[PDB]
Design a protein around this ligand. Structure first.
Ligand SMILES: CCCCCCCCCCCCO[C@@H]1O[C@H](CO)[C@@H](O[C@H]2O[C@H](CO)[C@@H](O)[C@H](O)[C@H]2O)[C@H](O)[C@H]1O
Ligand SMILES: CCCCCCCCCCCCO[C@@H]1O[C@H](CO)[C@@H](O[C@H]2O[C@H](CO)[C@@H](O)[C@H](O)[C@H]2O)[C@H](O)[C@H]1O
Ligand SMILES: *C\C=C(C)/C=C/C=C(C)/C=C/C1=C(C)CCCC1(C)C
Ligand SMILES: CCCCCCCCCCCCCCCCCCCC
Ligand SMILES: CCCCCCCCCCCCCCCCCCCC
Ligand SMILES: CCCCCCCCCCCCCCCCCCCC
Ligand SMILES: CCCCCCCCCCCCCCCCCCCC
Ligand SMILES: CCCCCCCCCCCCCCCCCCCC
Ligand SMILES: CCCCCCCCCCCCCCCCCCCC
Length: 272
């Protein structure tokens, strides 16, 4: 079933704000790719994997928000006689472009926190394995559940609303599992860090937990407000969540990684 954004007319400001957000997010991810590519060799080789993974994530999200911007521009046209941005015949906007590209974004964002946490070798591969399974089995189940928003909103002709509150509470259980795997990864760092680095890693985990909880709130948006205003607020708290959980988290984790590298022995990290 299509998105709830295809059953709502928009004002000029309502359409313009959403397309400005889609342009701004892909611009800031394209800039963050340049940033994480430039300042990648300033960290030690043992935490440079987390620096390369950040650039991989910036590749992944700029190739998601650009497609969302393209599909937002194609699926709607201006109707002058109503003063509205009505849809077009033939094209329908989809919010699954987010969920398809989160499958690379979420396990790498958790893995790069485990890397700065100091887990190497078999332990890194074993904590990546659990996190990838738990983040594939939650993102795909959210992707099934987000196909029932015309049903859960109340659009006539689109039934089957019971499958919206099932594949969200299913994806919640694996999200709790991911938070647990990251929690006992940040409670026991490896490599004997300092008491400031431990607080920074705990702050990294709590920041990830706070910026990842916005996504179940934006998921339930066509149950709270299935209106164009609700769609605008949903895209605002999607842009804020995207930037906070991928670029801001990357800059905070690179600061913790540089602190660890400059603490152990790295002169490029000490002079920076
Ligand atoms: C969108 C345009 C481009 C945006 C670019 C900017 C991205 C963000 C830059 C980094 C800013 C945040 O940087 C982060 O700040 C918090 C502020 O509480 C610091 O955190 C500090 O306070 C917290 C309070 O809970 C303590 O737990 C922590 O031990 C302490 O260091 C982090 O050590 C620092 O890494
Ligand atoms: C536009 C998308 C990309 C934006 C990224 C740029 C960050 C701009 C916001 C800066 C926030 C202030 O917080 C500050 O962050 C920078 C960058 O992490 C940290 O800077 C640290 O790493 C940089 C990069 O290797 C070094 O040049 C610097 O000497 C070092 O201290 C500071 O220790 C911290 O105090
Ligand atoms: C942009 C990268 C990030 C941080 C993506 C994260 C996505 C989630 C944490 C989503 C979680 C969901 C839950 C727990 C509820 C069901 C639907 C979602 C998939 C949105
Ligand atoms: C306006 C568009 C400008 C952004 C272009 C994208 C820049 C990509 C840089 C990636 C570099 C990867 C590592 C290069 C070898 C080291
Ligand atoms: C039509 C071409 C327009 C110019 C694009 C140039 C983009 C260059 C970006 C380079 C930034 C990454 C540097 C990484 C160094 C390692
Ligand atoms: C695809 C999702 C699962 C990836 C990991 C599977 C292998 C686990 C043991 C390394
Ligand atoms: C009625 C809507 C059904 C959606 C089914 C989703 C297919 C699985 C996604 C991969
Ligand atoms: C206890 C530390 C809280 C960190 C998260 C602050 C809010 C994140 C942005 C949303
Ligand atoms: C509009 C985009 C808003 C992005 C929010 C980023 C806030 C980062 C604050 C981090 C504090 C530690």
């Amino acid at each position: 079933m299509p998105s709830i954004e295809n059953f709502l007319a928009y004002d000029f400001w309502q359409y313009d704000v959403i397309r400005h957000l889609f342009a701004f997010s892909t611009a800031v991810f394209l800039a963050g790719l340049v940033y994480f590519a430039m300042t990648a060799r300033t960290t030690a080789p043992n935490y440079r994997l987390s620096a390369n993974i950040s650039a991989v994530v910036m590749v992944s999200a700029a190739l998601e928000l650009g497609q969302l911007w393209l599909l937002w521009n194609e699926s709607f046209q201006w109707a002058e006689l109503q003063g509205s941005f009505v849809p077009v015949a033939g094209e329908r906007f989809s919010n699954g472009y987010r969920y398809m590209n989160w499958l690379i974004d979420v396990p790498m964002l958790a893995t790069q926190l485990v890397v700065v946490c100091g887990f190497v070798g078999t332990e890194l591969r074993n904590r990546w394995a659990k996190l990838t399974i738990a983040g594939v089995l939650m993102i795909l189940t959210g992707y099934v559940g987000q196909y029932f928003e015309p049903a859960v909103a109340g659009v006539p002709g689109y039934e089957g609303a019971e499958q919206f509150w099932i594949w969200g509470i299913i994806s919640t259980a694996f999200f709790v599992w991911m938070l647990l795997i990251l929690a006992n990864a940040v409670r026991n760092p490896q490599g004997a860090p300092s008491d400031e680095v431990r607080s920074r890693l705990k702050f990294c985990f709590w920041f990830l937990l706070a910026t990842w909880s916005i996504y179940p709130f934006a998921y339930a948006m066509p149950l709270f407000a299935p209106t164009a205003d609700g769609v605008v607020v949903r895209q605002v708290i999607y842009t804020v969540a995207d930037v906070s959980s991928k670029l801001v988290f990357g800059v905070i984790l690179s600061q913790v990684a540089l602190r660890r590298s400059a603490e152990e022995g790295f002169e490029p990290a000490r002079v920076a």
